Swiss-Prot record, chain A:
<comment type="subunit">
    <text>Homodimer. Interacts with BCL2L11. Interacts with BAD. Interacts with PGAM5. Interacts with HEBP2. Interacts with p53/TP53 and BBC3; interaction with BBC3 disrupts the interaction with p53/TP53. Interacts with ATP5F1A and ATP5F1B; the interactions mediate the association of isoform Bcl-X(L) with the mitochondrial membrane ATP synthase F(1)F(0) ATP synthase. Interacts with VDAC1. Interacts with BCL2L11 (via BH3). Interacts with RNF183. Interacts with GIMAP3/IAN4 and GIMAP5/IAN5.</text>
</comment>
<dbReference type="GO" id="GO:0035234">
    <property type="term" value="P:ectopic germ cell programmed cell death"/>
</dbReference>
<dbReference type="GO" id="GO:0097136">
    <property type="term" value="C:Bcl-2 family protein complex"/>
</dbReference>
<dbReference type="GO" id="GO:0008584">
    <property type="term" value="P:male gonad development"/>
</dbReference>
<dbReference type="GO" id="GO:0010507">
    <property type="term" value="P:negative regulation of autophagy"/>
</dbReference>
<dbReference type="GO" id="GO:0005743">
    <property type="term" value="C:mitochondrial inner membrane"/>
</dbReference>
<feature type="short sequence motif" description="BH4">
    <location>
        <begin position="8"/>
        <end position="28"/>
    </location>
</feature>
<feature type="short sequence motif" description="BH3">
    <location>
        <begin position="34"/>
        <end position="48"/>
    </location>
</feature>
<keyword id="KW-0832">Ubl conjugation</keyword>
<dbReference type="GO" id="GO:0007281">
    <property type="term" value="P:germ cell development"/>
</dbReference>
<dbReference type="GO" id="GO:2001243">
    <property type="term" value="P:negative regulation of intrinsic apoptotic signaling pathway"/>
</dbReference>
<comment type="function">
    <text>Potent inhibitor of cell death. Inhibits activation of caspases. Appears to regulate cell death by blocking the voltage-dependent anion channel (VDAC) by binding to it and preventing the release of the caspase activator, CYC1, from the mitochondrial membrane. Also acts as a regulator of G2 checkpoint and progression to cytokinesis during mitosis.</text>
</comment>
<dbReference type="GO" id="GO:0051093">
    <property type="term" value="P:negative regulation of developmental process"/>
</dbReference>
<dbReference type="GO" id="GO:0046898">
    <property type="term" value="P:response to cycloheximide"/>
</dbReference>
<dbReference type="GO" id="GO:0071230">
    <property type="term" value="P:cellular response to amino acid stimulus"/>
</dbReference>
<dbReference type="GO" id="GO:2000811">
    <property type="term" value="P:negative regulation of anoikis"/>
</dbReference>
<dbReference type="GO" id="GO:0071839">
    <property type="term" value="P:apoptotic process in bone marrow cell"/>
</dbReference>
Length: 144, 145
């Protein structure tokens, strides 16, 4: 019978197939294609701007009392000269480094908080620009 | 829909953060850890058994006319002598190679059908073994040492 294990097994199938296709330059779906391009873009960005990115991550002193306001202020400096795809990649890489740092410092509780901050920032600040500049599909075209 | 951006942007955040955490040996969730261990196990298996795996994948070529039974027949031979985690990894890798081949042959439509055959096989055949052998959490523990 179709219980809860069948649902989680389907999720594993989709994830594994998405991975294998991506290794050959193919994609499970357009969403998987966006996820893959953004994973690779973040790696490329972190490699190209290692030293300058280290200076950015050091600007936010994450503690269990850190509110969205503090994250928004640092991220706003990133988009000071306007929005572009590269600055959006830097934004994802920044939230990415904050999560790693939180777990390193045994503050795993902050990971869910960071994820919610990122979603709010995207929706409030970046989504209108993303829509006006061809959506995530254009980012995939440009990156590939 | 009213919640479509909220859903998709959240999905992107979760995916990217899961990826960054995994690169440093951490995991977003227990499900993310299962997914990562299975991705790495698949790569390991494919590397260790390159020649034997080539013999297996050459047994089946999916066309728009291929029925589930042809897939189930080949997969059944993987588990004729019993189930273990390594044979489960080989099953996932097998499905992955069938999907790659479908896209190589410009038949991307078959990838969702293969994924549904894999889910059916797991539900109809492997759930009792997975449960009895400690679930996917035991696979993660065993693979990680
Ligand atoms: C993968 C990647 C590679 C490079 C960059 C570097 N960069 C730019 O290259 N900026 C371009 C404008 S752009 O449209 O963003 C160009 C893109 C080229 C391809 C396809 C698509 C996504 C990627 C990769 C960027 C467009 C410019 O100004 O000439 C930047 O926008 C940039 C952003 C942030 C920092 C930075 C670094 C450390 C602390 C704070 C900020 C530096 C450069 C960012 C990502
Ligand atoms: C990542 C990986 C590495 C090796 C194998 C090879 N292998 C075994 O090594 N089998 C073990 C028993 S086991 O419980 O599967 C051991 C595991 C060790 C770690 C942690 C966890 C998942 C992985 C990796 C296997 C348990 C044995 O027999 O002593 C096999 O069971 C095996 C399965 C299928 C084929 C095969 C090859 C080509 C065409 C068709 C089938 C060959 C060997 C499969 C995966």
């Amino acid at each position: 019978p179709l219980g809860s294990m069948s649902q989680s097994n389907r999720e594993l199938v989709v994830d594994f197939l998405s991975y294998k296709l991506s290794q050959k330059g193919y994609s499970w779906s357009q969403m998987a294609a966006v996820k893959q391009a953004l994973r690779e873009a973040g790696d490329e960005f972190e490699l190209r701007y290692r030293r300058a990115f280290s200076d950015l991550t050091s600007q936010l002193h994450i503690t269990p009392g850190t509110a969205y306001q503090s994250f928004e202020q640092v991220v706003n400096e990133l988009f000071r000269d306007g929005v572009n795809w590269g600055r959006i990649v830097a934004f994802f890489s920044f939230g990415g480094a904050l999560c790693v740092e939180s777990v390193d410092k045994e503050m795993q509780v902050l990971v869910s908080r960071i994820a919610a901050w990122m979603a709010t920032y995207l929706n409030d600040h970046l989504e209108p620009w993303i829509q006006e500049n061809g959506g995530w599909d254009t980012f995939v075209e440009l990156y590939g």
